[PDB]
Amino acid sequence: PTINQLVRKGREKVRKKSKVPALKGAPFRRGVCTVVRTVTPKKPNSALRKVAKVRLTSGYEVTAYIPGEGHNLQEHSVVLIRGGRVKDLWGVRYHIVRGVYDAAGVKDRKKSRSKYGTKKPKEA
Amino acid sequence: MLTDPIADMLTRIRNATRVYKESTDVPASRFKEEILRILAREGFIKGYERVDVDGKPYLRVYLKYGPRRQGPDPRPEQVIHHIRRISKPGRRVYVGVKEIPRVRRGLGIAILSTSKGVLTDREARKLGVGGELICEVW
RNA sequence: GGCUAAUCCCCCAUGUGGACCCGCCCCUUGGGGUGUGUCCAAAGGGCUUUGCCCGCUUCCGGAUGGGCCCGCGUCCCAUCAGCUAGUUGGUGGGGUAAUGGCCCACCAAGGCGACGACGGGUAGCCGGUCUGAGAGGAUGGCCGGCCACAGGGGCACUGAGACACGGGCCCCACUCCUACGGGAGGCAGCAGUUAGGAAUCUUCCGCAAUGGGCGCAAGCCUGACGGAGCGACGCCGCUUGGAGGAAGAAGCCCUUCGGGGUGUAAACUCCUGAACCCGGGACGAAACCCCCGACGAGGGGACUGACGGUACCGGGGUAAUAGCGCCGGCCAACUCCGUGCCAGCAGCCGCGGUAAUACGGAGGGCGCGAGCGUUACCCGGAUUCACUGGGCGUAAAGGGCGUGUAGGCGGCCUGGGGCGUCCCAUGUGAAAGACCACGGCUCAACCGUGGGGGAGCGUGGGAUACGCUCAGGCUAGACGGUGGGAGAGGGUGGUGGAAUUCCCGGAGUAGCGGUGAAAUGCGCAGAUACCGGGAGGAACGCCGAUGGCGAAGGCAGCCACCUGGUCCACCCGUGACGCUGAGGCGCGAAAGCGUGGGGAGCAAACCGGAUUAGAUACCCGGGUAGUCCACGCCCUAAACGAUGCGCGCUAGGUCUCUGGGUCUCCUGGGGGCCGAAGCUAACGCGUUAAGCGCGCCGCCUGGGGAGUACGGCCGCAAGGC
RNA sequence: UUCCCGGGCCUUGUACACACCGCCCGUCACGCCAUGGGAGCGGGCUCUACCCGAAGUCGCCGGGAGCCUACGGGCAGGCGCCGAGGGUAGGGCCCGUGACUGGGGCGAAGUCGUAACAAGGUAGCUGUACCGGAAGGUGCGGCUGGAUCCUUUCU
């Protein structure tokens, strides 16, 4: 474009969309499960993936993944939502956070425990 | 019509050199002649003269090259390896004195046209003035 | 209703001076002087009361604080294109400290807008901050500056100052009081409660310091403030020991059963001595006051801590917290077991469907370390909005073509000006931050002191190359003159032949037609094939090209008139009159729409015949709109060179059309093909650029959703932009 | 040497590359997210015309119609303009809700066709137009971004 054209028109700054309406921008929101369920993954894999539909304090309702192995959660559990998607499942944009609220940590889990919300094992 | 005569000089020169001519006629004006004076002084051209062509006056810019070469491509190095306009009609450019540019870490130039006359980079610094930044050459 | 004091209120007086009307002078927007006329002051209190301190009045200047006004800068949407009645100016007037439609009456009919008015969306702004190599992007928490608001809306009073957060009136919502009449509230002040949320502290100490209000002072007030408490929220310092100690215990790990690993790690040896115990124990603090001198200066001169018995100095003294992520690649770190498309992992690529360095533990390893990971958000990377710094022949991207408005851009020579541009001087660019240096807490973080820098804007001075500009030349661009050319360029009328169809006539039988084969259809009302005559419509064989003309779409018989563009020669005329072109306006294949004609052949739809597994298709036979014309709409396209216009530069060779030449050839101007240099991802391009440059317009920014939705505008509709 | 099969060499087109026992398009069915439209409803706001109008400032009255008076005037009170807001009648504005529905886009993967890629078996694409609810057929015109000089599906 000429310069007179850049003066006339000028470059367009570029917007972006938030891959997450947790809305509120907040780093997490609290919400209450509706469905706790399983689903069938996308094409390249096969498995049973545990997930909860949730009502969120944001006036917002979403399927959210339940990471770890052992999960307790049921239809009235109240849980804290994380953000991050499960690439092979449909419509799950967020993660549940273990150890917080009703979702408890992964029991028997010795290795990556910041994630998975599991306290430290004792020793003698 | 011709449109930026000074670009058109520098260009006539760029082409001329790449096809290795001995000389070229750029149609003439005191400003081009001044641009050239500086080129000669600085060692880029051999020199230039004023000629007439079917009556209408030009400038022969005689051209400088490297010596001949080794292997495939005997074509000699260029003396003006690079020539380009900077200020143009439609975007004019002016440097203050403290903005005048270091061209190829000094081995090239910048023709500034100042209120003191047309000078090189260093020439303007040592002179202490700013101007319309015409081209860089190297 | 009644009493009464004052530095409360009022009236005379004095007039230093001041206000105001009219005159004069100077100055120049309402600045200053002056004359006359008019109007204007005051408060007392305390002492050692004979003199001073505290105040009071009118004025002049100062200082500091502000009001108002102007240039410039200050986000997204044009799917917001028009907005405007005090609205735009004026005269008089009200108001104010003061200009002002700020307000009011009367008069004019203006003001604003693509240089984005109006509308809608978001938003306190800046100093600065984060990010970035920079340009730039993002942001504006704390500290400093300005603004604005104090439950929502309106309003004024008081005052130097407010339209007043802890002042007042009214309306509205809500909480509380209520003898139902009516009243009371206003933490976005320090704490604290409550809700909401992912989440954000103590209803602490102190007036010692600093600052502020009142006070002659003593002194009161101060949730400003100085401190303490809470939370790894951030930064910075610090500890979890130091040295010696196996050719290397045990356990645990692999193992090729030889061994390798954990690992100098531990045990143990020895030394220091975080915590903690003991004593001392701050600066911050010298004023206000005291006295002498005169309540000055000067001089001495004593009282005054929240933090705190804290920081710190001395003494004594104990081996005395480690965690978190990660180890398939990007990426530093690999092995065994377990699970077997499960359980799970997952930022992207992609792991797991029996040997998994990717899942889960374990050994070991890497990275950090009182942290370490996660999510969210910002910049970076991203030269992926490209000013620095990108593109559009086939990748996304040249607008279908043109005319031409605003706008952008502008050959050569000289002169004036000096607006851009440049230089110097100076003002400004607060402080804090940032950069430099030194210093203060044992260091740093943190702080102080000094230095330096700085775009921008004010003023003064200066330069004149380029850019503006004004005046004057020029002729190389552009236009013109004359003479000559080629052409399916356009419009209008005419007219020629071939062919088809049809009708008439003659002659002549038994089929014709059509296909891979067939059938439908036609044919004894005599078709086909043949000869002659007529009617009508549409299209123009050969020439014809690898050709020409046009801006594009597009344009073919011949003739004449009307008419556009264009090339060459001559070098004659004007004298930069130029290029581009958002908006506009006009053209714009075919199909399609309206009205009216026309209708030979062809032919969407349709009817039939075949064919196939079915046929709705290809193939056959019929056939309607339509194709043609006039006029009026529609405005699309592979509207193709998938290549915007103009100009300048950069080997040649070859074929051609068409001018001019001294016509083996040269020289303009078109059309092609090869190929310099160069470009290009490649293919290709290559004086008919996709090369090298400059100007201006159009356009692009992953695929699908989709040229969809919605809004607008056009259109008769179809549908278009 | 035409044909059937298997093969060698050059060349050409290609969207195939587990390579034509390849690719792939659409329809109906079925499982998901999200959109428009959407009648009315619930409500927030703003504009205009009219109407009612608290406070308060200003303006006028301020009268043998009140209070003060030094008769100069002052206050009370009255009326008025302006006016926060309220009601009445229509234009948009945004949010919420929604009977009704439009396709959509992947997604288990079934359904019948074979439209495109090889001259995809009728060369393809294309603006349009009529048809078939299937890819689609056909008409007119255009493009080359087309190969080489009866039919016959799928894996």
Ligand SMILES: [Mg+2]
């Ligand atoms: Mg699978």
Ligand SMILES: [Mg+2]
């Ligand atoms: Mg010379």
Ligand SMILES: [Mg+2]
């Ligand atoms: Mg530049």
Ligand SMILES: [Mg+2]
């Ligand atoms: Mg009384």
Ligand SMILES: [Mg+2]
């Ligand atoms: Mg009383």
Ligand SMILES: [Mg+2]
């Ligand atoms: Mg008084």
Ligand SMILES: [Mg+2]
């Ligand atoms: Mg008096």
Ligand SMILES: [Mg+2]
């Ligand atoms: Mg006097």
Ligand SMILES: [Mg+2]
């Ligand atoms: Mg005067």
Ligand SMILES: [Mg+2]
């Ligand atoms: Mg007097």
Ligand SMILES: [Mg+2]
């Ligand atoms: Mg008195």
Ligand SMILES: [Mg+2]
């Ligand atoms: Mg004063």
Ligand SMILES: [Mg+2]
């Ligand atoms: Mg001022």
Ligand SMILES: [Mg+2]
């Ligand atoms: Mg402004």
Ligand SMILES: [Mg+2]
């Ligand atoms: Mg009005």
Ligand SMILES: [Mg+2]
């Ligand atoms: Mg008025």
